[PDB]
């Protein structure tokens, strides 16, 4: 049982929409600390970790902590009815459905049946990332679209004063380069020259909900997974871990 209120329904809708393109179902943990959700896509190539602390909500009242199972495409469907001006309310009693309400010019309440979703659970492993890149969502989103013209895969290369994404196909190539002089490169910390490759299909889904001016943190290593995170209402966080393409 809970009542949780979030100002700006579309921003919340975008989160769920991104997640729904990677996973079909998720378990959402409503704790006193905030909402958390963790899942892998069925092929176990990508991990999603959503963390929305209670502080980003205008009201956060969890009378009884609870984990609820949700069909992501139907959650998306409903949340996409929210207008930018709408206040979002997520409310749950003892019954097995979630009440989603948009408060704006009218009060619009949807009832979503809840389902059984089995949580796999181990926490994030501590990985020895040798490169950290902070860049504008614009560059990331662009570069991924650029690369898809040419390949199904994109190579990330980090050296101490340059970050490059490159894709090659059949004669055609593209390289997207940032140096510390560039606007869109906010930070670059490199322990050792770092190279890994990733699938464009996954990347595309991952960055769809990212804003052009959002600050996105990339962490990766040589033939290691990519960790990608961006902030939600400052304290919230959506984190992806994406397994590499090797050879």
């Amino acid at each position: 049982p809970f009542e949780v209120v979030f100002d700006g329904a579309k921003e919340f809708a975008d989160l769920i929409a991104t997640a729904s393109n990677l996973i079909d179902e998720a378990a959402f943990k409503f704790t006193e600390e905030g909402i958390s959700m963790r899942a892998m896509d069925p092929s176990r190539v990508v991990l999603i970790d959503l963390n929305l602390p209670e502080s980003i909500f205008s009201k956060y009242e969890v009378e009884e902590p609870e984990t609820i199972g949700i069909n992501m495409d139907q959650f998306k469907k409903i949340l996409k009815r929210g207008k930018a001006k709408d206040t979002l309310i997520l409310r749950k009693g003892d019954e097995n459905f979630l009440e989603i309400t948009f408060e704006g010019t009218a009060k619009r309440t949807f009832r979503l049946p809840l389902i059984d979703v089995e949580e796999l659970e181990l926490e994030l492993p501590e990985l020895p990332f040798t490169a950290k890149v902070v860049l504008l969502g614009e560059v990331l989103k662009e570069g991924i679209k650029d690369a898809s013209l040419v390949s199904d895969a994109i190579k990330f290369i980090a050296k101490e004063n340059e970050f490059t994404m490159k894709a090659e196909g059949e004669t055609n190539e593209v390289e997207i380069r940032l140096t510390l002089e560039d606007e869109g490169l906010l930070d670059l910390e490199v322990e050792e020259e770092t190279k890994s490759a990733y699938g464009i299909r996954y990347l595309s889904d991952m960055v769809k909900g990212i804003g052009k001016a959002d600050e996105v943190i990339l962490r990766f290593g040589n033939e290691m997974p990519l960790q990608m995170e961006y902030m939600i209402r400052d304290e919230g966080r959506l984190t992806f871990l994406l397994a590499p393409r090797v050879e």
């Binding site: 892998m40 190539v45 990508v46 492993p125 290691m224 397994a243 590499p244 393409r245």
Partner: peptide, 9 residues
């Protein structure tokens, strides 16, 4: 090859 995340769990 598209690795899975399993080796890292």
């Amino acid at each position: 090859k598209q690795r899975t995340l399993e080796s890292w769990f």
